[PDB]
Write a protein that binds this ligand. Structure first.
Ligand SMILES: C[S@@+](CC[C@H](N)C(=O)[O-])C[C@H]1O[C@@H](n2cnc3c(N)ncnc32)[C@H](O)[C@@H]1O
Ligand SMILES: C[S@@+](CC[C@H](N)C(=O)[O-])C[C@H]1O[C@@H](n2cnc3c(N)ncnc32)[C@H](O)[C@@H]1O
Lengths: 371, 223, 120, 371, 223, 120
RNA sequence: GGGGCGCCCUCUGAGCGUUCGCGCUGUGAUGAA
RNA sequence: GGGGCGCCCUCUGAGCGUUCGCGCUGUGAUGAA
């Protein structure tokens, strides 16, 4: 009765000599646990799922994929051997999309790879989590830049609107979106360069297209020449650049935020968590701030007894969607869980976002059901 | 501007107003990519510019790679993922039904790979040493194509080791070798050719000059 | 536990518990991690009591390196359930701080001078 | 005694039948006069230099280049004929670089073509001067954008410095120039990518190169990876873009300023003249402002009884170089000539900058010589 | 990147990392040009990219123009100056010792020409109708090369008229004609060829396809 | 002169000069282009006097189109030297404005109603 | 019981839901911007 | 936080240099930020 042991994201699977499943213990869909056990598997510590599996089989001889485990499994009193690229281990991976559903780790293929994705990202951030230290300050500079870009866009768009109104005054009130405005100035310039089919290539409904081109002929503005167009375009294209840079920094923000303080990120999001660090100064200084201090990180409201008052944290979809009277009780619950999330990332600990979100969800649901 | 379908699946060519041709991939995730590569639209669909001088693979295609194993629904193990440029294009070629497991060593570069692998749900990034496939044996899956582009003197049998782990039978392998051009055929590359012939089958050896004036690619079938 | 800097004997552990109990009806104390941290920052704290069996450990791990900065001693207790009921509560507490000793002025002064020896 | 008449920028030249100079009257090096007489030459009115020339020869028969003149010269009582591409007129232009010096219009070749350049620009702006109206408002938007760019650069550079200090704190105080700072971040990134020869390729003296690279190794800052570099570079390259856009708008500004209000421009410069129009609202509103109002276009100092007080106009090199006591008397003189310059461009009149600058120069010299 | 001297004076070719060749002119005024054309340095000297698809002249050079009359110290009359792109390159070729008198009709475009002619002290811009050389007879000078690129049906004798005014004897003329390709030589272009042969001498007729799929250039010597 | 909108007879030209002279010792007037323009903008001006022989002409050409906007009539005088000495000055003036007519109240009211006829 | 100087002044610190069994809670109840 | 009246509407307005001949000046003297 020789058993080949397979350890994987899905769990621990015991095979016979011919690639038939003998027994399995499935890993739970917790990112925090699987990540930590995977780091242990590198040193040779088996999954808790393996210990349970070996208990419910107690085989004559076990043969493991990884040579670092051999001593650690012999310590339990099993006869252990080691094959590297065993014909069994391959057969397992040959049918990996399926066996994940077969051992009931996932319901279908999509959410398995959707889990494996969230994992592959987390796992490879844990090996980064003992970071080249200073990473939090960079995220602060990243989120401050985003605020500096948003503040810049408004300045340039206002100037671009006031400039372009000389050629086309009707356009200023037709589109309140600063981006779309700059896009029209970029690819066209002169009013009489606009067509019906040229405007659909940007995603516009027919009810506004017939408002623009009807205003194009009925323009009160004066004729303009290519000096002014090339000059206006400089700002117009820069607005379009900044609009890209902002969206691109946001993608960079997520990559830093999930690396330096992943537990804070899982609660509030990347942007809100970043903006919290900005007020504190560093990650360590957020951990030293108790639950009561986090809740009031507006600093202007408390010093009186800021814009969107009682806590900067209320941008959270559960304090924004829910009515005005529930807001006091939720803000505490979030700040309490934020306190833990800060300290747990300050030690550079594991991932507890999957439980903390479920702990907050239970308490938000217990506030909504009390009338 | 015009976009034309080429021999290889999910890979296109881009005719320009100035006449130049740059390789093209179907952008799997729209709106993004942002600052760096150039974004272009043609008849509704969004496409991404694939530079043949930065990508060794794109070099090989222009260099006349007869048969490309990477197509729609291909699962690949990419050893030497780096900053993500080249895999993002295989991400595009592979589409959502196929998968790209990427293994990169130096942290300084992986963090960039993460950002790329964030938005693309078919790329699975891994900080790991390719000399120890045991370290990711627990995460990855058996693949259809083995792409190996490592900065090592012993790439050839690092790939071979990885192959007998994850590469399917009858599968394919793209190796990158620091390889010079005359009128034999593959007598020049016998050192790395014969080392594979112990358990592999050589199909094409392609010298990347002048797209990459150092490296060459060996397409191989696993027995 | 890795956040425990020094080994604490059981005799001093129970003598710490009794020092807090006396201050609940003769002096003033603060109960809970949040308030305990607020006491050390302000400088009102005289002695900090930390539970050993807290999970996850990270919730109180900041206190020992905070109390060293503001020059205030701190002691560990073996149980959180034994610290919770001692503080006149029905639930467990992770950390407690003393501001006014009350009837435990001589009991605290003995504790602070016994922990300084096992530190160095 | 048949004379071939040549009219040109240099003046009026009388030739014989074989291309020999008989007599000449040289045009004065005034842009305002030559431009206006050139517009008259299209209608057929001769140069005043021609009238003088014909007086001092009174020929038997004159033959002119342009057929529009024939009647206008016959009105004086001369026998006039018309050859289009006469062998004489060509011979004149064959030796045009030389005859300009020969008739003493210019001292050498360089300043002749330097004059012809200033002219060709002015002449072809006069034909534009009866304009497509609204041009002044565009210049206002152009100079306001330059102020909006300068205000933006400071915001991004400050953020870029604070961000990059994480990798290199020593660099922040080493170069106070915002541009040079962003250039280093753009082409390099990591500190250890800097060489001695790489820094000279930007124009640096050896005394600062050995300060930078000595600070590169002695850096207190933490190690950074290519996420942060690619992110920092986004801002760094945008700063470099804006630095170009500003310099490019300034070139556009000159082209508009010399077209819409050339007389104001000749006095103060393109930038100062533009900034004056910004406060007024339009060109017409500057003409309606009397000499006393122009002098006090700071608006904050007068309302008390702004930054660089007694007149915004003092940025003029003659009020800035000269000591504190002369400033009151010069500010009046400039504002008085600015008043004229505004009204003369509001009518869309000629060029009088060459006399106005000489009128101001005489009065500035009469203030400096009174102790 | 590399810059190599070509047959024609003050005109260079630019080797790139991607292999493409773009025509090159010696930037007479450094620091500027700014936003639009690409700026490049090679061994101290700054060069400007000359696109062959925007410039009809640059088309003709790549199309194999045997002898270019525009060189160092050339004085030109440029009829059809437009937005200044193409003259800026002749400004570069001509250098400071030669001169470029540019005549453009529509104001909408001249204002752009001004900005170009501002920084370059060898370009002398003129808002004028090319049908009336009397209007600028008073400003310009006798030139060495007549470049004519007007959007008119009667260009051929508009240029001829201008030529007998300003073009030196033994001088040259570049005409632009809305001209189609077979195996005669110039029998196809006889309408405009013979019209010149009354007082000009034909040297080369060059069809600009595919750089400009409409126009063709006729290089001519004036007797 | 091209900035002269209407032909002015010599009789009304001298009757305008006399109307300003009377206001120099019985009312209040403003002398010079700068002050004259300041009078029309504020609305204090009743009548504006413009010299015909000003060079360059452009210095006063803004007044006629400014005075039409604020509904204040204006008259031309044939000489600037004759307007300068009339205003009690030793130099010539380009334009003058009247705020308080004084002893020339009936003389101004005759002028304003004689110029409105030659306008339309 | 009444006033001038410096200091810690960076929410409060024990309750609430309940079917009266018991539940959620100092790892933050409740009261505020 | 909302509207009807007057006011400063955003310098002053006639002098200064001089060899005592006369010069620079309302197309802005002089006095101020
Ligand atoms: C030449 S680069 C590949 C470039 C890639 N095709 C691109 O452009 O995106 C090779 C990479 O392999 C990585 N590498 C080096 N040793 C490795 C190892 N032992 N295991 C995995 N990757 C390694 C290096 O970090 C290096 O960046
Ligand atoms: C085809 S464009 C020349 C393009 C030019 N080579 C460039 O790329 O910079 C011809 C120009 O001649 C101009 N033009 C038309 N009629 C003209 C005329 N009568 N006299 C002078 N120029 C004229 C037009 O404004 C038009 O822009």
């Amino acid at each position: 009765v020789k058993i080949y042991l397979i350890e994987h994201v899905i769990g621990a699977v015991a095979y016979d000599e011919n690639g038939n499943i003998v027994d399995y213990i499935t890993n739970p869909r917790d990112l925090g646990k699987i990540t930590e056990e995977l780091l242990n598997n590198e040193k040779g510590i088996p999954f808790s799922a393996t210990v349970e599996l070996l208990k419910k089989v107690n085989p004559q001889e076990v043969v493991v994929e990884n040579e670092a485990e051999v001593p650690k499994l012999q310590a339990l009193g099993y006869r252990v051997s080691y094959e590297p690229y065993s014909k069994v281990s391959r057969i397992f991976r040959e049918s990996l999309p399926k066996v994940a559903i077969d051992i009931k780790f996932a319901s279908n293929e999509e959410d398995y790879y959707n889990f494996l994705h969230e994992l592959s990202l987390e796992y490879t951030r844990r090996k980064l989590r003992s970071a080249a230290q200073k990473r939090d300050l960079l995220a602060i500079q990243a989120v401050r830049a985003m605020d500096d870009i948003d503040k810049t866009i408004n300045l340039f768009s206002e100037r671009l609107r006031e400039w372009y109104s000389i050629h086309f005054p009707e356009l200023d009130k037709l589109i309140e979106d600063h981006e779309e405005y700059a896009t029209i100035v970029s690819r066209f310039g002169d009013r009489g360069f606009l067509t019906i089919d040229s405007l659909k290539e940007l995603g516009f409904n027919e009810q506004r297209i017939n408002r623009i081109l009807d205003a194009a002929k009925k323009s009160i503005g004066a004729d303009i020449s290519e000096d002014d167009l090339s000059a206006m375009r400089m700002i117009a294209n820069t607005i379009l650049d900044l609009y890209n840079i902002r969206r691109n920094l946001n993608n960079y923000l997520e990559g830093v935020m999930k690396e330096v303080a992943p537990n804070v990120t899982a609660l509030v999001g990347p942007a809100l968590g970043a903006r919290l660090l900005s007020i504190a100064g560093s990650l360590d200084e957020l951990a030293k701030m108790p639950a009561s201090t986090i809740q009031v990180l507006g600093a202007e409201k408390a010093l009186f007894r800021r814009p969107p008052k009682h806590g900067i944290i209320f941008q959270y979809p559960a304090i924004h969607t829910s009515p005005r009277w529930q807001r006091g009780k939720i803000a505490r619950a979030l700040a309490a869980k934020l306190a833990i999330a800060a300290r747990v990332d300050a030690f550079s600990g594991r991932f507890i976002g999957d439980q903390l979100n479920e702990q907050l969800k239970k308490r938000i649901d217990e506030i909504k059901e009390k009338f | 501007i015009t976009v034309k379908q080429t021999n290889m699946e999910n890979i296109y060519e881009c005719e320009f107003n100035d006449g130049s041709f740059r390789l093209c991939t179907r952008n799997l995730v729209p709106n993004f990519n942002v600052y760096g590569e150039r974004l272009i639209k043609y008849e509704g669909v969004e496409y991404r510019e694939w530079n043949a001088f930065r990508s060794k693979l794109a070099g090989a295609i222009l260099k006349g790679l007869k048969t490309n194993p990477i197509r729609k629904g291909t699962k690949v193990l990419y050893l030497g993922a780096a900053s993500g440029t080249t895999i993002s294009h295989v991400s595009d070629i592979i589409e959502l039904n196929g998968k790209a497991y990427g293994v990169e060593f130096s942290p300084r570069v992986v963090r960039e790979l993460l950002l790329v692998a964030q938005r693309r749900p078919n790329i699975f990034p891994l900080l790991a040493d390719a000399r120890f496939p045991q370290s990711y044996k627990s995460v990855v899956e058996n693949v259809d194509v083995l792409y190996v582009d490592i900065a090592q003197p012993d790439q050839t049998d690092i790939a071979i080791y990885n192959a007998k782990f994850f590469l399917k039978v009858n599968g394919d392998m793209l190796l990158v070798i620091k390889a010079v051009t005359k009128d034999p055929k593959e007598i020049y590359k016998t050192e790395v050719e014969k080392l594979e012939n112990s358990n592999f089958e050589t199909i094409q050896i392609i010298n990347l000059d002048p797209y990459d004036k150092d490296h060459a690619i060996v397409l191989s079938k696993y027995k | 536990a890795s956040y425990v800097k020094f080994e604490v004997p059981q005799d001093l552990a129970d003598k710490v518990l009794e020092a807090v109990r006396k201050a609940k009806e003769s002096g003033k104390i603060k109960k809970g991690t949040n308030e305990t941290t607020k006491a050390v920052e302000r400088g009102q704290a005289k002695l900090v009591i930390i539970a050993e069996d807290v999970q996850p450990e990270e919730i109180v791990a900041h206190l020992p390196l905070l109390c060293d900065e503001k020059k205030i001693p701190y002691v560990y207790v073996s149980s959180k359930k034994a610290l919770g009921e001692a503080c006149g509560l029905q639930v467990a507490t992770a950390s407690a701080a003393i501001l006014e000793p009350g009837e435990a002025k001589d009991l605290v002064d003995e504790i602070i001078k016994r922990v300084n020896e096992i530190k160095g």
